[PDB]
Amino acid sequence: EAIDFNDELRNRREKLAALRQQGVAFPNDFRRDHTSDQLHEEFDAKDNQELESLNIEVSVAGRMMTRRIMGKASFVTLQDVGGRIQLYVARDSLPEGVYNDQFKKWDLGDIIGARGTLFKTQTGELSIHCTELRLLTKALRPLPDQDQEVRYRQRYLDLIANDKSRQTFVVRSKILAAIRQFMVARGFMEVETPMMQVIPGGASARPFITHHNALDLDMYLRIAPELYLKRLVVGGFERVFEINRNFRNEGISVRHNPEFTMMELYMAYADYHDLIELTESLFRTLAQEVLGTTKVTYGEHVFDFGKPFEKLTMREAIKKYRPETDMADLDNFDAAKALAESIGITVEKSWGLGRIVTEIFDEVAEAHLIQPTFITEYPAEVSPLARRNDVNPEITDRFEFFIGGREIGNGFSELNDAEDQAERFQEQVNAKAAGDDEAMFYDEDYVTALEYGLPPTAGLGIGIDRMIMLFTNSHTIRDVILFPAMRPQ
Amino acid sequence: EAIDFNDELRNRREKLAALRQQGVAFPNDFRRDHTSDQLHEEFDAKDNQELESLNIEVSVAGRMMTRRIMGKASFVTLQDVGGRIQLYVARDSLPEGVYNDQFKKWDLGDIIGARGTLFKTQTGELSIHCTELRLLTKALRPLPDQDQEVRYRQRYLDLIANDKSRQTFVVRSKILAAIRQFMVARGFMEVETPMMQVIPGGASARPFITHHNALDLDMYLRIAPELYLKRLVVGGFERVFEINRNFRNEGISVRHNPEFTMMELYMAYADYHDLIELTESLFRTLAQEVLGTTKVTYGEHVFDFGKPFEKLTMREAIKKYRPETDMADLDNFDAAKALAESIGITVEKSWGLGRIVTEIFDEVAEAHLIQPTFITEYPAEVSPLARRNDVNPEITDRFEFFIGGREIGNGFSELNDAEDQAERFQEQVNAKAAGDDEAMFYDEDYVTALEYGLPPTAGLGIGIDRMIMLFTNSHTIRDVILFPAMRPQ
Ligand SMILES: NCCCC[C@H](N)C(=O)NS(=O)(=O)OC[C@H]1O[C@@H](n2cnc3c(N)ncnc32)[C@H](O)[C@@H]1O
Ligand SMILES: NCCCC[C@H](N)C(=O)NS(=O)(=O)OC[C@H]1O[C@@H](n2cnc3c(N)ncnc32)[C@H](O)[C@@H]1O
Ligand SMILES: Nc1ncnc2c1ncn2[C@@H]1O[C@H](COP(=O)(O)OP(=O)(O)OP(=O)(O)O)[C@@H](O)[C@H]1O
Ligand SMILES: Nc1ncnc2c1ncn2[C@@H]1O[C@H](COP(=O)(O)OP(=O)(O)OP(=O)(O)O)[C@@H](O)[C@H]1O
């Protein structure tokens, strides 16, 4: 079976040895003057009669992907960064002996450099008549084809062969710096806040712990910059944002990765209603720049980011997707506990009325939110950093928004109430001691920072990785992350 | 003494309570239509005769910094994001009672919003004739002045008061996205590689360790993306870069921070000589855009980034700054060990000839490199990822470059030699077991990735934080990092 593959490994190493007993092995002096796209966008419209008479020399380098050897001439496909180009490897277009003694002896996946002139084949294809041809790196292993997880264990392979996957990560990088251009253009300053916090705060999840060996001190890997960005606002950086990693112990998932990219952005003298008018206007502007169209296919669905997003209260969503729901039960703890238990929810000792009304929303409405939707009016019990609402103080001015069943973003009117912020970190701590290992920590510092005066403000957080998925039609986070986290072996 | 300061804390809280028994406390509905800079760049050239007759209403919000109360009118300095502006708080320009019952009762540091029309005072200063005036957040603590380290423990204060410090962090953000515009313009793709590696590699330093609670797995906080960026090159991302954090256990320093920002950039089919022609051309382009001039003051020195950097071999630097040095001693281990011991160096059991020749360079020449300098020809023993040199294999094609006594950057021709890369990870491991806890780990994966073929390449790393220091004349890393790491209490 596949021991003529171990014939390949062996044979390549013996080749590499003899190159080494010459000096040829691993040279770095070759210089190319074009990539593959730059020849195609400059010369595809030209036919042979033009290209033969134009007589353009070019130098290129890449990974040899095919080789038909027709005798005294061959045909080599060279793949580099911008695609693939065609080589015409003639015996007597090369210097005496390169064709028979070097070119024939090279394997696929090897790195070659080529110099020659452009033309068009019988096909009409753009090809390089090679006149110098060089080996640049000996590939000791041959190109693959397997496992569906090789693409994550060895992403270098998936980038070489799959082009969906390659153009996905080129769209990712366009997206990231398209978000920035939009965020600056609005007047925001990209800051860098610490990824090693000593008290982790700003979201509700289990952090990674590490020990600083020079200060006897245990640090945490931040679960959000939220507490620290809000410090900068008090400082008078009144339009800050930060697109960077964060770290949560959540398991390896298809909506989760223990390290993931998130933007957070805070805007002074503005309320959450202004964060909607930017979430909407962002996703429209990203859809237009990345895709040329407000309308975006994703899975079996199509989303229209030109069209305004749907918007419901949390209670509206429940009574919409569970219409038999006696809405009075969201008002009394025992009735809410019973209601939650009846639809499957296991209500914990550490749950109060708003958490039950939330965990019931989570059951009943969430995955049904498929067109982009905002869900406003979150309970206070679950939103320890959001402002309280003016007409009803047991609910915050906080929206989460959803596209296709997942939470993308989370924003709210911010809590510029020092004292109330302290007492809500108390409830979180009372909550951890009741058995909630995702409760917050009391950040005695952040509470001080508020006492110095935090201007009324509203802030937003948006999972970039989830959003990268929407614009590349990828359905696992492990497909928009270059090196996604592995369950090992 | 300072118990009329605890009179201030008490008095502010009692104020905030009575606002709360009204509803006024923490409103968020105020909207401003200008910041302070936008009034100054639009109306400073105008005199009163123009501004009185133009009659421009404006709304602004900020932190009240001063208040002269002259009786039936006052003068208030309002500081917001873009600077400070002047308010003319008249009694009868405000709605009945705001002046006597609200405006007088507000403290400094409070967040007010103001609406009014522009004019010029007797001074000729640009001021707002207030006609609506509102309290937006009650500051429970008053503005400071202390300790020289408060600026790092509570950076929100240092941004409010010190303006050197504020404009330093605004220059930082201009620098970061000026590097990107220059890096893209050259044709590089900003990627995101994992900050949680399972085998940390790519530099020589002690990493942070953490445990992933869902996979029984111990992760490390990456000390560089170097191993992973080079994977992406093999994939055919032949121009990648990444400006992001990394993490080392190094102590809290003035050239170090346990988390710090670094760019790394890899370029296919190019050698380290091409990384110089970009280090030079970067620092020139950054000096020109950030400062308007190729010449940069820093400390007692002045650097000229228009002028080409000085360049020495490692041995040239030694024999220049220790001219009596018998250069034959850099060739024999025992003579090099004796030479090192004589200038103070304590040579370890795990040191070979090149490490001694390096640690001797480190003693003898390094801090004398003040004008921007390149130091080429590093020994192999200390450069496990660099390519070997063609004429002498015991030295790599690796330069480190220095400005003003510190190492800024580190680049080299990259090692596209699979087998040699494996045997050099062996020496590193033999080295850890000899007593070097900054030796590398054998990354059995990275070795495979090379076997698939790494095109000849050259890569560079540049400490951004150190470089931010050069362009803001700041001399501690703790002054270009928003929240620098604290020795606690
Ligand atoms: N001041 C407004 C709130 C700002 C952000 C807030 N502090 C926060 O972190 N909210 S969140 O709901 O925890 O996260 C925002 C987004 O992060 C994304 N996220 C969270 N955990 C992960 C994981 N594990 N992988 C990928 N993406 C993730 C997801 O899209 C969330 O909607
Ligand atoms: N392939 C070329 C090499 C690329 C970079 C290489 N892997 C590397 O990390 N080299 S380095 O010398 O370790 O770091 C580059 C710069 O990082 C900076 N650095 C390193 N540690 C710290 C700390 N602790 N604080 C601040 N800046 C730091 C410093 O400017 C170094 O010159
Ligand atoms: N205490 C909890 N009990 C049950 N499920 C929970 C709890 N906390 C979080 N989850 C669930 O964990 C999953 C992770 O979902 P997701 O990351 O999209 O957002 P989330 O509900 O806001 O959580 P987080 O606070 O981790 O961001 C969700 O299905 C979420 O409801
Ligand atoms: N094994 C060692 N023995 C003595 N000093 C060392 C050793 N390793 C690093 N140092 C010193 O630690 C300090 C940290 O310096 P710096 O961060 O500027 O660059 P470096 O010498 O290349 O180290 P690193 O590998 O940590 O980046 C330097 O003064 C450096 O020489």
CSV table of N, CA, C and O and ligand atoms in Angstrom, one decimal, chain B residues 204 248 250 256 355 359 400 407 438 466, ligand 4:
chain,number,residue,atom,x,y,z
B,204,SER,N,14.2,33.6,23.4
B,204,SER,CA,14.9,32.9,24.5
B,204,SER,C,14.4,33.6,25.8
B,204,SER,O,15.1,34.6,26.2
B,248,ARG,N,6.6,37.5,28.8
B,248,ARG,CA,7.8,36.9,29.3
B,248,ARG,C,7.9,37.2,30.8
B,248,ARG,O,7.3,38.2,31.3
B,250,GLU,N,10.2,38.1,32.6
B,250,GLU,CA,11.2,39.1,32.9
B,250,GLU,C,10.6,40.0,34.0
B,250,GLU,O,9.4,40.2,34.1
B,256,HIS,N,11.6,46.7,30.2
B,256,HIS,CA,10.7,45.5,30.2
B,256,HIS,C,9.3,45.8,30.8
B,256,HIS,O,9.2,46.7,31.7
B,355,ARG,N,28.3,31.7,22.7
B,355,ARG,CA,27.7,32.4,23.8
B,355,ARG,C,28.6,33.3,24.5
B,355,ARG,O,28.3,34.5,24.9
B,359,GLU,N,28.2,37.0,25.1
B,359,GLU,CA,28.0,37.7,26.4
B,359,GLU,C,29.2,38.7,26.6
B,359,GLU,O,29.0,39.7,27.3
B,400,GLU,N,21.1,42.2,15.2
B,400,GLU,CA,20.3,43.0,16.1
B,400,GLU,C,20.6,44.4,15.9
B,400,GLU,O,21.8,44.7,15.5
B,407,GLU,N,18.4,47.3,22.9
B,407,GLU,CA,18.0,46.6,21.7
B,407,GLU,C,16.6,46.9,21.3
B,407,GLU,O,15.7,46.8,22.2
B,438,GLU,N,16.4,29.5,30.2
B,438,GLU,CA,15.9,30.3,29.0
B,438,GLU,C,16.2,29.6,27.7
B,438,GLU,O,16.0,30.2,26.6
B,466,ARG,N,9.5,49.9,23.1
B,466,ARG,CA,10.8,50.6,23.1
B,466,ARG,C,10.8,51.7,22.1
B,466,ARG,O,11.2,52.8,22.3
C,4,LIG,N1,21.7,34.3,30.1
C,4,LIG,C1,21.8,35.7,30.3
C,4,LIG,N2,22.8,36.1,31.2
C,4,LIG,C2,22.9,37.4,31.5
C,4,LIG,N3,22.1,38.4,31.0
C,4,LIG,C3,21.2,37.9,30.2
C,4,LIG,C4,20.9,36.6,29.8
C,4,LIG,N4,19.9,36.6,28.9
C,4,LIG,C5,19.5,37.8,28.8
C,4,LIG,N5,20.2,38.7,29.6
C,4,LIG,C6,20.0,40.1,29.7
C,4,LIG,O1,18.7,40.4,30.0
C,4,LIG,C7,18.5,41.8,29.6
C,4,LIG,C8,17.2,41.9,28.9
C,4,LIG,O2,17.7,42.7,27.7
C,4,LIG,P1,16.9,42.8,26.4
C,4,LIG,O3,15.5,42.6,26.7
C,4,LIG,O4,17.1,44.2,25.9
C,4,LIG,O5,17.6,41.8,25.1
C,4,LIG,P2,18.4,40.3,25.0
C,4,LIG,O6,19.8,40.3,25.5
C,4,LIG,O7,18.3,39.9,23.5
C,4,LIG,O8,17.4,39.3,25.8
C,4,LIG,P3,16.0,38.4,25.5
C,4,LIG,O9,16.3,37.1,24.9
C,4,LIG,O10,15.3,38.3,26.8
C,4,LIG,O11,15.2,39.3,24.5
C,4,LIG,C9,19.7,42.2,28.8
C,4,LIG,O12,20.5,43.1,29.5
C,4,LIG,C10,20.3,40.9,28.4
C,4,LIG,O13,21.6,40.7,28.0
